[PDB]
Design a binder for this molecule. Sequence first.
Ligand SMILES: CCCCCCCCOCCOCCOCCOCCO
Ligand SMILES: CCCCCCCCCCCC[N+](C)(C)[O-]
Length: 198
Amino acid sequence: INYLVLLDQLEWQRSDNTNNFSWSVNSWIGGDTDRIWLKSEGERSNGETEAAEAQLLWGHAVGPWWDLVAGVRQDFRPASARTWAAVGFQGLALYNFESEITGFVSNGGKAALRLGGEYDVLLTNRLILQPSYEVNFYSQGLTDTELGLRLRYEIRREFAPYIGVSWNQLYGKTSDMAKREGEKDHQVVFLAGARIWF
Ligand SMILES: CCCCCCCCOCCOCCOCCOCCO
Ligand SMILES: CCCCCCCCCCCC[N+](C)(C)[O-]
């Protein structure tokens, strides 16, 4: 009936001797009370997609801005794949906020939880500063946090180039493995990209 295509982040990322193209896409299709969400979010470098993740979710409205979502998450790595059942809650109001809390369950008793949010701070009607956060837990369990700041200029409302920074931290076993591989367990990542929706 209607739809929204929101390519929320299409961005090249630069940190310590790393470089990738990353994406975060969060789109939906349907009616006023029920919709199908298509989410996708991933990284590639050197023509090799290092990692990709997709979710297909039924969203049922529970109030003016919030949906209950239930569906499937599919993770891809070059030599492996993993399927999760997903259930959570998703809020979205364009030019205001997005917020999500989703749990995931997979075969081997594996569970995960993701918290995320962003909100728009209008500097002008077209220059918009967007702080964001994402928190990931895994249990077989806090694994990682990303605190972002993206400054976009809406040329068109449909094409908004931006620059930004993300403060990324690892925790616990993920942090210990990072250090064991000779790497810091935190990064400042620099971003250039575009936000596109229609
Ligand atoms: C509030 C905005 C913070 C601005 C931080 C500075 C961003 C500077 O970098 C912008 C251009 O670079 C972005 C990432 O680079 C792409 C990765 O590959 C490039 C290879 O050089
Ligand atoms: C279970 C997740 C909790 C999310 C908290 C939601 C905030 C409640 C108020 C925002 C809007 C609620 N509303 C109006 C959609 O019903």
